[PDB]
Amino acid sequence: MSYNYVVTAQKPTAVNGCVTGHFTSAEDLNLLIAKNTRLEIYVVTAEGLRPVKEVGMYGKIAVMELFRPKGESKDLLFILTAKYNACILEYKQSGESIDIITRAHGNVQDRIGRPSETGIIGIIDPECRMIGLRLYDGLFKVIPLDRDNKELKAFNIRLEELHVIDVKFLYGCQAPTICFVYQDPQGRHVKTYEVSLREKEFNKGPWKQENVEAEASMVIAVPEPFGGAIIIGQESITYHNGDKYLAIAPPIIKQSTIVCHNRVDPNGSRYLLGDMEGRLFMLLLEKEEQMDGTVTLKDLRVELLGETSIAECLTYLDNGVVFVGSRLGDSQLVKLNVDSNEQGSYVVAMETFTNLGPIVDMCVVDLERQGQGQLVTCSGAFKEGSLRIIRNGIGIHEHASIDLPGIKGLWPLRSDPNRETDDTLVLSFVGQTRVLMLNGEEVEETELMGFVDDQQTFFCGNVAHQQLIQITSASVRLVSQEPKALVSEWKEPQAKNISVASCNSSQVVVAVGRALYYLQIHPQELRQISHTEMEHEVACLDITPLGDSNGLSPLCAIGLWTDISARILKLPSFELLHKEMLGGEIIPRSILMTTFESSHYLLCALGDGALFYFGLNIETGLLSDRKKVTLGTQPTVLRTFRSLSTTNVFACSDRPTVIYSSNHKLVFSNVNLKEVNYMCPLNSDGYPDSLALANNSTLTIGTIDEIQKLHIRTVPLYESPRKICYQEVSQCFGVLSSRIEVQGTTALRPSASTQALSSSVSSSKEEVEVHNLLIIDQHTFEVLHAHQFLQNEYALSLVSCKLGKDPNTYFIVGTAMVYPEEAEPKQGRIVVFQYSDGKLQTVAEKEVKGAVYSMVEFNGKLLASINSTVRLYEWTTEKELRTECNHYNNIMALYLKTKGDFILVGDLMRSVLLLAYKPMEGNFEEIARDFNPNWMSAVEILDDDNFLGAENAFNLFVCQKDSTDEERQHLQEVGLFHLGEFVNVFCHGSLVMQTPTQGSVLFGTVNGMIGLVTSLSESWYNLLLDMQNRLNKVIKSVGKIEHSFWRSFHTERKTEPATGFIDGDLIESFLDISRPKMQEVVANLQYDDGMKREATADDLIKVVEELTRIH
Ligand SMILES: Nc1ccc2cc[nH]c2c1
Structure with missing residues (x-):
């Protein structure tokens, strides 16, 4: 009923995890990077990172760990996907051919199970006795590491502690032994258990439980000769080994939560620690000798090294080189010097790697020439926040x-x-x-x-x-x-x-x-x-x-x-x-x-x-x-x-x-x-x-x-961009931004909103967010003006438009007043600004009784969503907004798009709804709604009859009218697809200079992936679906995951095969299979050059070429 094609324009750039070891050979030092669905393998050299192999998984990588069983000459790789596909992988090189072989695989989901709120944890015993998974509260899943266990069969152990914060396997234990932090009404505690393969049960652990800090959040298992565990919290670092307890409370870490760690020395003498502000610390463990030849921990010290990008992960690579994997900014290679510099920093940046993520908003503009679109994103967060300007081709x-x-x-x-x-x-x-x-x-x-x-x-x-x-x-x-x-x-x-x-x-x-x-x-x-x-x-x-x-x-x-x-x-x-x-x-x-x-x-x-x-x-x-x-x-x-x-x-x-x-x-x-x-x-x-x-x-x-x-051109803001709109008549962008100040309140660093050429403030008729409208020059990207909103005012929505019979183009901002004890906002404003003579003038303000989540220009009127209400405003001759009509049947109307007299509304939890404005009644009619509950993240109108939705569990769907009266009001979900990314924004446009495909919708995601959705005819859909089915028979997938399983629509409420969506990434991969495989794929297909006759490889090569040039 609906036929859509979805393809990657830019692969995800955010780093979700990183490991080092000896995967490609016993002698190579490797860095492995997980970027959502992509696994990148590098060899580390004096030169730097040499790329050797990049693969795509049919899954979101949730766990990635190297380990080396007895009998293996180099490390094997354990992957778990977000859909609970487990595999053990081996790197094989035979001359110039590089293959990732699946040594073991299976799906480890339980039948009953609410996913743990705090995420999948996967750990491997240092002696390779077992893999341990924390997937659901109250259960610890064990995969025994027998060579016979090629299906990765597992068993569950009841875990009495329901709320595990973090868990690791300990070193130096005769039985496999976990150490974890958990939370109960009496606070947070550290406890151990032995894991008995013979009993399929926990046994008493080697050291008694201790109370730990209220915000203890990470467990580090320290190798021999120390053994034991380090527990990191917000204001303390402890070491535990049973007859051993050592705690420090160093003031230097108190300012920002430490969220990643990495071992520098193989024997655990030194660790890197990174915090949410990009600080980089060294944690040093001092040894004490003993007469019996054991080594015990004498003391702990933390030293500030310097500042990096905000790190999701850190990996020391030897010779003072550190890879800084970032999800909120650019990743980096940095060097750690023995000696500090003039500012006192031991950190020197060596190389920077682009990250577009998160993309929180974007627009398309023909900046330079007509018909040559460029994408301008709001990217990153905090000190990493930026605009990115993206354009096809080499200059x-x-x-x-x-x-x-x-x-x-x-x-x-x-x-x-x-x-x-x-x-x-x-x-x-x-x-x-x-x-x-x-x-x-x-x-x-x-x-x-x-x-x-x-x-x-x-x-x-x-x-x-x-x-x-x-x-x-x-x-x-x-x-x-x-x-x-x-x-x-x-x-x-x-x-x-x-x-x-x-x-x-x-x-x-x-x-x-x-x-x-x-x-x-x-x-x-x-x-x-x-x-x-x-x-x-x-x-x-x-x-x-x-x-x-x-x-x-x-x-x-x-x-x-x-x-x-x-x-x-x-x-x-x-x-x-x-x-x-x-x-x-x-x-x-x-x-x-x-x-x-x-x-x-x-x-x-x-x-x-x-x-x-x-x-x-x-x-x-x-x-x-x-x-x-x-x-x-x-x-x-x-x-x-x-x-x-x-x-x-x-x-x-x-x-x-x-x-x-x-x-x-x-x-x-x-x-x-x-x-x-x-x-x-x-x-x-x-x-x-x-x-x-x-x-x-x-x-x-x-x-x-x-x-x-x-x-990619990067424009650093040094604060969080939130929304963007282009104003052609002013030759500038408007950008909503937020900066953190500490409580009045003090800014942590200069940033776009504090460094504008001129500035204005609203007059009132990680501590606090201060929101701003930035006016940014389209050529230089200089910050021309910044307008600061009221205290506790959050700017949520932005449009540039003309209204009514007024010839001026305005920046219009929707806000919410945010108070701690309110479950949602009960106050907000719509503010109409005019940019003239280098400054923003406030033309008009309207107080409303809720958060203004979304606004759209609508036939010369302003459409806004305010809490559970969609409202249409007219711009009067006296330059004020006046309500024309309201729609009330929502829970929380977060997202709006329009086409003609039609409005698509995206709800917090009740999917999408189609309104029409009725020009001869001056009100809204509710045409149809999708009665399937979905937690929406973004919506788009593809055309008059097709509505695209993205939801929080990384799926797309497409709704249409069902062609009774009660019947006409039911939208049908005719397209379903697991994308595996979180869509923040959809926007009509193309990066290709202005066919199998009709229309072009770009989308931006949390991981920095940019995608494209276009429409297909039934005939093209049928041909490509047949191609996919044939490709899926011939392509060996990493971890032996089925493509159909991967793309199946999946939420807590339902799992269904994809329908009405072609995976363009899979289709495009046809161009990279062998010629015999192409023959296998083509056999006995019908293709129309004419009349429907047998397709050849060369036909399909041409077809897939037509498809590649839509991005
Ligand atoms: N113990 C052991 C040794 C090798 C492999 C390969 C997959 N699982 C393994 C377990």
Whole structure:
């Protein structure tokens, strides 16, 4: 009944957890990072973090722990998902193939069970005797770690203590032993139990329980030789080992709750601690010797190290390097110095990693050009709060521009053998060559002795033995560097024209029609080594040397006319090693051997925009794993360039593209330029690390931005952004923000709201939140003005709009007055502001008797939700708001969207409702509601008949009218899908320049994931659903979780299969399965090019390409 497609535009960026150990090999130090559904694996080096493997799970990662059973040569990985999928994983590398194998799996949910309010805890015994899970209050689940237990069968033990705060397994125990903090009416306590596998029960623990601090929140199990447990609370740190109790109450920790810990030293001598304000502490355990050779704890000390990003997790990586995993701001690598700096800090930031999360609001604006949307998010919280401006594609910064038509090729040269930098740019034209010298930023034409100017150049460059080479249609010319003189010239025996050229430092391959010649470059000599006749005319050549080759290629890659083949030939024999037939009647135009992330590839571009690529074995010449992308409709020209110490490929066409690697897969990202015909890298004194680019009329020189799909600009606020709206007439954004002050009240740090150019305050007719409306310039993102709201006033909703017959555009803010003893607010305001002359004027205020959760402009009127009431206001001639009509049938109307006369209302707990304004009655009619209870987080109108909802348990659903009168009032849930993210905001728009799909709704999430929802026809839905079912049979899932299980709608109240939703991530993955798998997937499908007939792999590759470009 409803057909929707949902796909990831930006994967989650928030770090939910991190572990270190020896997973990829016994000798590697790994860092593993969980970003919701994604597991990232790195090797730690002196250099830094090397990415080795990234996988997606069909689940939200809730537990992630490395452990090493007896008999295992490296660590295994335990994962538990939020849906209670358990697995044990092993990393296997076989040559260049990397696989995550599932050693054991099973689902560990109970039948009865309310999920613990305080979350899943999973722990592993240091001796690998068992895994312990705290999933539900009153129960401790044990998975025995027998090699026979491949289904991860478990048993429950009754836990008398219902409210466990934290739990760990202790070190140095003859029986597996837990230590936990729990809360009862008498306060908080620490207790132990032994876990008996033979009795399937707890036994008495090795040390008696103790009372601990009221806010004790974390247990640390200390390794030998200490043993025992550290308990961290808000104002104290204790150590327990039974006949041993030590407690400190250091004032330095009292200001902010400590929420993460990490062991620095293997023997437990030192720990890192992080708090909610980003402070980083060292906790030091002092040893005392004993006559019997045991070691006991003499004392505990805490030292402030410095400040990081607000940390969800901390992992020491050796050599003073710490990974700071953040969910509220950017993650970091930081260095800990033995010695402090001038401010007193031991912490120096080394690297920053983007985190968009939480995305609490966003909007789409065409900031720069028409039809080019950019997303502007409210991101992060507290000192990490920011705006982020997100846009597709890679930018070029143009530093020179020369009118110079008809360029047919570009080559950089070093004319001076004792200078590292290029100083020369050689240009081809039809039948001609020109040489440009670069003196600083000046670009002067010149002659270069030895080169000819009256033939078209096909290649020129630096070659061996301090020589230059020029290959024209007439000849190969070898030139000495000092002086510049012709030292050798090669021509074909009858002086026929050269038609194609390739060259490296010491080797040349030229074609003459069907003939190939192989030359070597020697001192003052072009030596003809070998020649052959090809079966067909030669279209293109490459001899780029790959690997540890000492600059010599044993391979020649060639593309031919007629059979449209890409072939790998041996040099010098020209023996055929491998032939691939690319199909069609359009010849190959560019062919390249290249390396990305240490793997070798063959790229071959056809004249119609198709790019084929293959893995290349540089020993045997074998091509494998053919893939195909479309990069335009014109011939593509491929050229290697380096930026930021990585070789990538620039693809010149009508759609210029950079080809690069991510996670050992090739990626293709648009370059934000009009058509580029030719390019070369250029690294000159005046133009360092640059690119020369030519079109039909112009030569450009510029630098390229970071090679990535999305560009992100960060605007730090140093306080929490809450809501955003764009006001085109003022060329600014309005942003609601909140800062923490301590109780009047004192600010903790300067921030956007305290650092505006000018400021205003409402006049009254982690201690406290102070709320502000910020006015932010759309170009500079400077804070132009800040308006501070009343004490205890929280700003909840924001719109920019015109109303009534008034020509002005206003910022309008809805608020709540927040008092401690109120279950909800009973007072709030709507405030209408005008931004003029650098300041906000208050135009009008309206007191209302509740919180103004949501506002929307509605046909020149203001629609607002106020507690349980939806209200429509008119803007009168006297510039005040006046109630037109009200709707009362809500619990708490949190979310509003409108389309025409229709309003979609999202409720705290009663799902969604559809209102209509009735223009000839001047009131609302309730059209229909969804009678299924759902705890809503966001809503959107997809179209007049389809309503999208997101809810608190990470599901999407779609409601429609059911097409009685009591019947007409029941919305039907026709689409259901477990997304696995928490949606804060939906907004119509696209990041793609303005099909299988209709409409575009972007969404932003707590983890910083951005997604897209679009609509499908029944026909497309049916085809893609069939594809999913076929993909799910062939793809091996990590942990052997079923895709259908993962995507099943799931709340405490119900579990149902997904319906009416295509998983775009799964569909897009079709492009990465093997060709036999593609055949498996395609068999006996129906596809419409025409009439419904059998689909081919190539059909579906094209389809999934159409789908990828919607984001
Ligand atoms: N004891 C033991 C050893 C290896 C594995 C692999 C999965 N579960 C295990 C338990």
